[PDB]
């Protein structure tokens, strides 16, 4: 069907110049007496616009018989540029294509007009931006590429001059103008053989301090041949680009050559990049190479890549290079040589963190050696708690240097913790989890705030006397890690007598209804552990109804039925079971994250034991939303001021930003402790909803 009505920006998106790729028999292949006269009279016939008519009435004495043109060169050129500087939109195609033709007949005598012609052209491209016509842009950029096609013989040495003339198009900060003009200039780059292109690349790199994306588009359009085929001069254009690179250019030019290599690698599929890789390897044999190597290992002879990387490492960036080589490598011998280089590669915590975020595979040898070589980075790396590589974490955590473990045991023996030595003991016990007597002693000394209590409970879960001391501390009492410690003690008689001696579990069975569902799940898993170590049908129904909490529409349609059945059982059927059922009902009605479950709770609150804890819990819920709890623990300040290897790409910028955030997480100890304090469980929330 016809009639689609693409918008103006839509047509600009469809636009690409490529006039030598546009193949018709236009006028110029059929040449009369002049080369200008045929396109003159043809446009005189096909187009009517009043200033084009009076222009034709002005120049008709001198258009015909090309001696007339070569005599009357300047005067009718001034007539041309005056009418283009008049510029109604309907006269633009004839006058502009005639000015395009006005150089092809002449050749060298147009170079006394060339600069002023391009000046009128760029003024009219600004007028075209305020005109909003994709046809006008198409004609103007088409005639510009025509001028460059007809004058590429004489525009060899003056490349720097003409790009300095056309630099209001490249750095215009309106990206489709530069995306247009970069095609024409890239055709000129494809024209110019070697040395003038080298000087042009030098001046273009030097003038770089929105010109960066324009230079990227010019390089990509110079390499841009047909579909899945590279340019014929691409192997030499990469040579001129690498010669202008390698410490001959500014800082952003390295990322510019990187992004040009990225777009060229995305364009040319596989076989078109044999000679490009050969020329780039020949330019890389001499020895900035780091951003280039990471860029060429982005897009996926890896042994030759490993050999060149080993030479350039014999002589962060090396961490990102090794991470990408690990994510896309194919040789276990090269991986072992990379472990040999990882012996000399610093920041191995951040390197292993980004590598484990990338993949999870064989050759995990250097982790134990880095642990034996041995602070805050090891603290954060062990603080990566529940990963997919936890199966290797729990098996390789023993391989650390136990001298550091016994040294932390000497710091965990005595603890004079006022405000920050509790945090220092938290940082110690985090590593000491991967390392019972000192645990119970330090826990007694510590119980003699919330973050230090949660960290002590983590060492408690990592650790019947200890169970009695933990029950005494729970009678003396964040709560998520505390219930983790309690469940780890209860699952990891004498214990029956020790639990029957102390009366407990009523406080936890009452305060299981918290505003955090993970805290509710931890309390529900802890209370069943206590009732197991010292009824169970209704408790397991309440645990299973809170188990299927992934409230997708199938499971959320299922959960109202499951909660209604368990509530019918526990309402048609002890004081502790009534407290646990009331706490589960209060937690379900105070979740306020799914209105499916809050309909089942409003159904289940209709047949309860009258005013047992119902109206008391309702008054507690109404009073919970008059003020809010706050003020978690603080820390000091830290500063990375680092982690840059890229400027602007599509996905390479995202991968580099991910490695930069990884390095800023593996930054200094104050930021590491701030990230550790950020790594917490849930808390009280949902104000105004409860």
């Amino acid at each position: 069907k016809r009639y689609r009505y693409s918008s103006f920006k839509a047509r600009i998106d469809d636009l690409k110049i490529e006039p030598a790729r546009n193949l018709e028999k236009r006028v110029h292949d059929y040449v009369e007496s002049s080369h200008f006269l045929a396109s003159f009279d043809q446009w005189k016939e096909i187009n009517l616009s009043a200033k084009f008519t009076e222009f034709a009435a002005e120049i008709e004495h001198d258009v015909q018989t090309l001696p007339q043109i070569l005599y009357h060169d300047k005067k009718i050129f001034n007539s041309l540029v005056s009418f283009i500087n008049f510029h109604d939109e309907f006269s633009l195609q004839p006058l502009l294509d005639l000015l395009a033709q006005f150089c092809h007949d002449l050749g060298p005598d147009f170079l006394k007009f060339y600069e002023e012609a391009i000046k009128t052209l760029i003024n009219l491209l600004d007028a075209a931006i305020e005109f909003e016509s994709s046809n006008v842009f198409e004609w103007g950029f088409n005639c510009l590429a025509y001028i460059f096609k007809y004058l590429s013989k004489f525009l060899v040495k003056k490349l720097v001059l003409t790009c300095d003339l056309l630099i209001p198009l490249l750095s215009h900060s309106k990206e489709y103008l530069s995306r247009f003009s970069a095609e024409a200039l890239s055709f000129l780059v494809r024209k110019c053989p070697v040395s003038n292109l080298r000087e042009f690349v030098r001046s273009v790199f030097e003038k770089l301090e929105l010109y960066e994306g324009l230079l990227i588009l010019f390089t990509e359009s110079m390499t841009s041949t047909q579909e899945t085929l590279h340019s014929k001069a691409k192997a030499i254009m990469s040579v001129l680009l690498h010669e202008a690179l390698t410490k001959s250019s500014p800082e952003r030019s390295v990322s510019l050559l990187s992004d040009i290599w990225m777009n060229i690698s995305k364009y040319a599929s596989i076989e078109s990049l044999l000679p490009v890789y050969e020329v780039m390897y020949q330019d890389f044999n001499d020895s900035r190479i780091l951003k280039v190597l990471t860029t060429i290992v982005f897009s996926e002879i890896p042994d030759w890549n490993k050999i060149t990387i080993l030479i350039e490492r014999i002589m962060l960036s090396q961490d990102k290079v090794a991470f990408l080589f690990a994510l896309f490598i194919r040789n276990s011998d090269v991986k072992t040589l990379t472990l040999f280089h990882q012996k000399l590669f610093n920041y191995a915590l951040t390197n292993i963190s980004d590598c484990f975020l990338e993949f999870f595979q064989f050759a995990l040898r250097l982790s134990y050696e880095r642990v034996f070589s041995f602070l805050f980075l090891k603290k954060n790396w062990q603080s990566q708690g529940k990963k997919i590589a936890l199966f290797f974490l729990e098996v390789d955590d023993k391989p650390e240097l136990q001298k550091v473990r016994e040294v932390n045991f000497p710091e965990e023996f005595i603890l004079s913790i006022r405000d920050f030595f509790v945090t220092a003991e938290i940082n110690d016990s985090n590593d000491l989890f991967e390392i019972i007597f000192k645990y119970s002693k330090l826990q007694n000394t510590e119980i003699i705030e919330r973050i230090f209590s949660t960290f002590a409970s983590p060492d408690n879960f990592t650790k019947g006397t200890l169970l009695k001391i933990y029950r005494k501390e729970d009678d003396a009492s964040l709560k998520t890690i505390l219930d983790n410690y309690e469940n780890y003690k209860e699952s990891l008689g004498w214990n029956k007598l020790v639990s029957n001696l102390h009366p407990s579990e009523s406080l936890k069975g009452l305060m299981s209804h918290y505003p955090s569902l993970l805290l509710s799940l931890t309390d529900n898993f802890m209370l069943p552990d206590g009732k197991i170590r010292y009824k169970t049908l209704m408790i397991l129904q309440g645990m299973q109804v809170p188990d299927l909490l992934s409230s997708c529409m199938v499971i959320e349609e299922i959960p109202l039925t499951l909660q209604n059945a368990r509530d019918l059982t526990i309402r048609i059927k002890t004081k502790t079971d009534k407290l646990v059922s009331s706490f589960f009902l209060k937690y379900l009605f105070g979740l306020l994250t799914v209105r499916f479950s809050p309909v089942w709770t409003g159904v289940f609150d209709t047949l309860p034991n009258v005013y047992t804890k119902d109206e008391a819990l309702v008054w507690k819920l109404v009073l919970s939303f008059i003020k809010l709890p706050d003020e978690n623990q603080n820390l000091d300040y830290y500063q990375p001021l680092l982690e840059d290897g890229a400027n602007k790409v599509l996905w390479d910028s995202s991968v580099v930003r991910l490695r930069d955030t990884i390095d800023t997480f593996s930054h200094i100890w104050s930021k590491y402790s701030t990230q550790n304090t950020s790594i917490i469980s849930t808390t009280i929330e949902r104000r105004g909803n409860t």
Binding site: M553, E557, T593, P598, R686
Partner: protein
């Protein structure tokens, strides 16, 4: 006769065939939408509070009922304690998620700071090898465009008035000129 019974919370529905017509004899001359108890009509189903739907007779046409309604339908208004086989246990999901912005805000309890855009329902449809995830829509959502159009309506009203009551004055200038003339 045949009794289509539908559990509403799951929403499931299955049919039964009811012989022993003196169970059906209490349905008779009773108006549509009146209460029916579980054990009080039948044998096995206990405590199932119902209400009759009415509907189609013999050969399918529709207050006071006779024995022509072969297809009698019920929804389980209140479940008793009978463990049904495809109604109460096997749950079918509610199909279409909420579409409107404040409808989603009611469905997940959002406040006036959320600007939801992630509390949308999701779905992944499976070709078998290449998945297609989809977020449908948040309609009646406050956009940057909607208050732009509200601002444009304000600007158009104030511009029309601030041209009209001034063109009044430039007419009154010519009227004052003719009054000084005459």
């Amino acid at each position: 006769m045949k009794l289509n019974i539908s559990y509403p919370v799951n929403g499931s529905q299955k049919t039964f065939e009811i012989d022993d017509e003196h169970r059906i004899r209490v349905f008779f001359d009773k108006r549509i939408g009146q209460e029916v108890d579980g054990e009080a009509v039948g044998d096995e189903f206990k405590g199932y509070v119902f209400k009759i739907s009415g509907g189609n007779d013999k050969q399918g046409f529709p207050a006071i009922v006779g024995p022509d309604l072969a297809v009698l339908a019920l929804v389980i208004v209140k479940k008793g304690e009978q463990e049904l086989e495809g109604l109460t246990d096997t749950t079918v999901p509610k199909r279409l998620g909420p579409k409107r912005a404040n409808n989603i805000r009611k469905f997940f309890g959002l406040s006036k700071e959320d600007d939801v855009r992630d509390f949308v329902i999701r779905r992944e449809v499976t070709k078998g090898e290449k998945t297609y995830t989809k977020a449908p829509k948040i309609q009646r959502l406050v956009t940057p465009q909607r208050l732009q159009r509200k601002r444009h309506q304000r600007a158009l009203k104030v511009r029309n008035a601030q041209a009209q009551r001034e063109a009044a004055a430039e007419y009154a200038q010519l009227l004052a000129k003719r009054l000084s003339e005459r």
